[PDB]
Amino acid sequence: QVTLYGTIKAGVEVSRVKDAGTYKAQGGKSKTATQIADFGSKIGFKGQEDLGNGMKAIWQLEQKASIAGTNSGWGNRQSFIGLKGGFGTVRAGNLNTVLKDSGDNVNAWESGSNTEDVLGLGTIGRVESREISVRYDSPVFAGFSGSVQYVPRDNANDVDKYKHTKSSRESYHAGLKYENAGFFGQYAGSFAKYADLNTDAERVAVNTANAHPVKDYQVHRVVAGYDANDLYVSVAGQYEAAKNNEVGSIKGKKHEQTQVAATAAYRFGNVTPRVSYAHGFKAKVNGVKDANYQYDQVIVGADYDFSKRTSALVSAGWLKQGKGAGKVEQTASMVGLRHKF
List contacts with Cs ion (CB under 5 A): 125, 128-129
In the bound complex, what is the minimum distance in angstroms from residue 110's beta carbon to Cs ion?
5
Cα separation of 12 and 312, whole Å?
11
Find, among 317, 270, 332, the residue nearest to 12 by Cα.
Answer: 332
For Cs ion, which is the closer residue by CB, 129 or 245? 129
Which CB, 128 or 303, lies closer to Cs ion? 128
Is 99 in a helix, a strand, or coil? helix
Q: Can you count the helices (H) and strands (E) in the chain?
A: 2, 19
Q: Which amino acid appears at position 250 of this protein? A: I
- Name the residue number minimizing CB distance to Cs ion: 128
Q: Minimum Å distance from CB 248 to Cs ion?
A: 25
CB hemisphere CA count around 87 (13 angstroms) = 10
Any alpha helices (H) in 120-274, and if so which ranges?
A: 153-156
Distance of CA 331 to the CA centre of its chain: 20
Query: What is the DSSP secondary-structure string of 11-66?
Result: EEEEEEEEETTT--SGGGBPPPEEEEEE---EEEEEEEEE-SSS-EEEEEEEEE--
Find, among 46, 56, 43, the residue nearest to 6 by Cα: 43
- Smaller CB distance to Cs ion: residue 121 or 285? 121
Let me know if 48 is exposed, middle or buried by CB neighbors in 10 A (0-12, 13-18, 19+).
Answer: middle
268 CB burial (10 A radius; 0-12, 13-18, 19+): exposed
CB of 238 to Cs ion, least distance (A): 12
CB of 126 to Cs ion, least distance (A): 6
Cβ closest to Cs ion, residue 88 vs residue 265: 265
Closest distance of CB 328 from Cs ion, Å: 8
Amino acid identity of residue 310, one-letter, is T
H helices within 24-166, ranges in order? 98-102, 153-156
Closest CB to Cs ion among 84 and 188? 188
| CA 218 to each of CA 142, 196, 244: distance values in angstroms, whole numbers, following the listed order | 28, 11, 12
Judged by beta carbon, residue 129 or residue 331, the one nearer Cs ion is 129
The nearest distance, CB 19 to Cs ion, in angstroms, is 9
Least separation, in Å, of the C-beta of 118 and Cs ion? Answer: 7
Q: Which of 1, 299, 242, 240 is nearest to 121 (CA)?
A: 299
> Considering beta carbons, is residue 129 or 186 the nearer one to Cs ion?
129
Minimum distance from residue 88 beta carbon to Cs ion (Å): 24
Residue closer to Cs ion by CB (options 129, 321) is: 129
